Design a protein around this ligand. Structure first.
Ligand SMILES: O=C(O)CNC(=O)C(=O)O
Ligand SMILES: [Mg+2]
Ligand code: NI
Ligand SMILES: [Zn+2]
Length: 331
């Protein structure tokens, strides 16, 4: 069995290996990369996403979100307060202001210590889930707007044609912006490219151990757990590495830098934070190996999770027994 300790693997594809996306995902899996829940892919030196980032300032962040925390430094929830619209140039200036800028630090480990000590005492502002792409149309390799769609994958594997679309999303971050513990919708894969700026630190639980994280979360967030049998789908709960280690939960950590891709694998729980002003692009995707995970994915039906149009068909076809309850939670 490849990668039996479930370590995060780092890959360096050549330009020839970078041509065929599906083939390379399958290669990484042949080496056991999915056992970690997360892998890093460093593009060949010949590749670029686009020519420059000099002309992105006029992109609009229609609904910036202020992430307000409640709890204790290592075990907290966050809610998102909507703010007035602003451009990427305005948001960059805000991220660099004395109130929001990254503090002085020695190295990534010192900054990680500072994040977990101090996060709750501040409310950073995140531009999230902005439909769009920063890949040049002429970039033919690993262009996150030109991937095979999940609807086409389901149709290829199962024979059923379904409605829905699959497009990428942009994220603009600042110091302390936070992504809560979650798996993807329908336990899909994700891919994330860090286009520019400061790093992103990730934490991940191996898929084979995801239910250990779920049981700890029910203990640590007991009101939320009574409210909903899949409350991590709400994407609001944070648990620090120190608390995970105290409770024996298997996990790993890695820092992504600009120019690097990360892939999350089906049912890989992940969380993390941004180091300073940055911009990332991410999208969900599927492979044949995903179908079994889609069939078994938990679902929130309490009303909180609310998701895209295209998840309807995935539930309806893969989880017909659950469909009527889930759709009620959508309405
Ligand atoms: O970068 C972010 O804020 C969140 N991204 C992801 O959860 C992802 O790519 O799966
Ligand atoms: Mg612009
Ligand atoms: Ni994710
Ligand atoms: Zn719920």
């Amino acid at each position: 069995a490849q990668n039996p300790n479930c370590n995060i693997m780092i890959f360096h594809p050549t330009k020839e290996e970078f041509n065929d996306f599906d083939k390379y995902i399958a290669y990484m899996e042949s080496q056991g990369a999915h056992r970690a829940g997360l892998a890093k892919i460093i593009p060949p030196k010949e590749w670029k996403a686009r020519e420059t980032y000099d002309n992105i300032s006029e992109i609009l962040i229609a609904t910036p979100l202020q992430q307000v925390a409640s709890g204790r430094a290592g075990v907290f929830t966050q809610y998102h307060k909507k703010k007035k619209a602003m451009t990427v140039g305005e948001y960059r200036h805000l991220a660099n202001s004395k109130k929001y800028q990254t503090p002085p630090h020695q190295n990534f480990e010192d900054l990680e210590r500072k994040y977990w000590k101090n996060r709750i005492y501040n409310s950073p502002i995140y531009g999230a889930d902005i439909s769009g792409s920063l890949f040049d149309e002429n970039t033919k390799q690993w262009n996150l707007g030109h991937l095979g769609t999940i609807q086409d994958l389901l149709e290829k594997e199962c024979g059923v044609v379904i409605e829905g679309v699959n497009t990428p999303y942009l994220y603009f971050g600042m110091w302390k912006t936070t992504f809560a513990w979650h798996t993807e919708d329908m336990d899909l894969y994700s891919i994330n490219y860090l286009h520019l700026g400061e790093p992103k630190t990730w934490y991940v639980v191996p898929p084979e151990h995801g239910q250990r994280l779920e049981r700890l979360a029910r203990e640590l967030f007991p009101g939320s757990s009574r409210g909903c049998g899949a409350f991590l789908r709400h994407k609001v709960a944070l648990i620090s590495p120190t608390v995970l280690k105290e409770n024996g939960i298997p996990f790993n950590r890695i820092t992504q830098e600009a120019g690097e891709f990360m892939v999350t694998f089906p049912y890989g729980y992940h969380a993390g934070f941004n180091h300073g002003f940055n911009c990332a692009e991410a999208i969900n995707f599927a492979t044949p190996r995903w179908i079994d995970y889609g069939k078994m994915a938990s679902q929130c039906s309490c009303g909180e999770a609310r998701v895209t149009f295209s998840m309807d068909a995935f539930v309806r076809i893969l989880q017909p027994e659950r469909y009527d309850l889930w759709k009620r939670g959508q309405d």
